[PDB]
Design a protein around this ligand. Structure first.
Ligand SMILES: O=C1CC[C@H](CS(=O)(=O)c2ccccc2)C(=O)N1
Ligand SMILES: [Zn+2]
Length: 105
């Protein structure tokens, strides 16, 4: 259990090796303005995503970061967000834990 794939289609997304403890934890439980709760895992790196639109700072869960919606590049499932425009690090991924499947390389 070291690779993360899209739960809907099996697209390769990320690795346990690429987890990032942002503010001391890789897990952040957050809500959007529509009151939806997400258990977000922070990754330094991800692949197989498609980033939609241009970055926004509105309602960012991470101070100093703008977000873009990250879809599965294969099936279009909403897997989380790319964060940019910040510092240490400049960029990272917040992926919704329950939309990933963990398994062998
Ligand atoms: O750090 C973040 C990521 C984005 C998220 C909003 S969202 O991606 O849920 C969304 C997008 C467009 C219309 C409604 C809601 C949020 O509140 N905070
Ligand atoms: Zn997918």
């Amino acid at each position: 259990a070291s690779i993360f794939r899209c739960r809907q289609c099996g697209q390769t997304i990320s690795r346990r090796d690429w987890l990032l403890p942002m503010g001391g934890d890789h897990e952040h439980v957050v809500f959007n303005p529509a009151g939806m709760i997400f258990r977000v895992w922070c990754f330094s790196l991800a692949q197989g995503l498609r980033l939609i639109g241009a970055p926004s700072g509105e309602f960012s869960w991470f101070k100093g970061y703008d977000w873009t919606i990250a879809l599965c590049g294969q099936c279009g499932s909403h897997l989380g967000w790319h964060y940019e425009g910040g510092s240490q690090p400049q960029t990272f991924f917040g992926l919704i834990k329950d939309r990933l499947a963990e398994g062998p390389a």
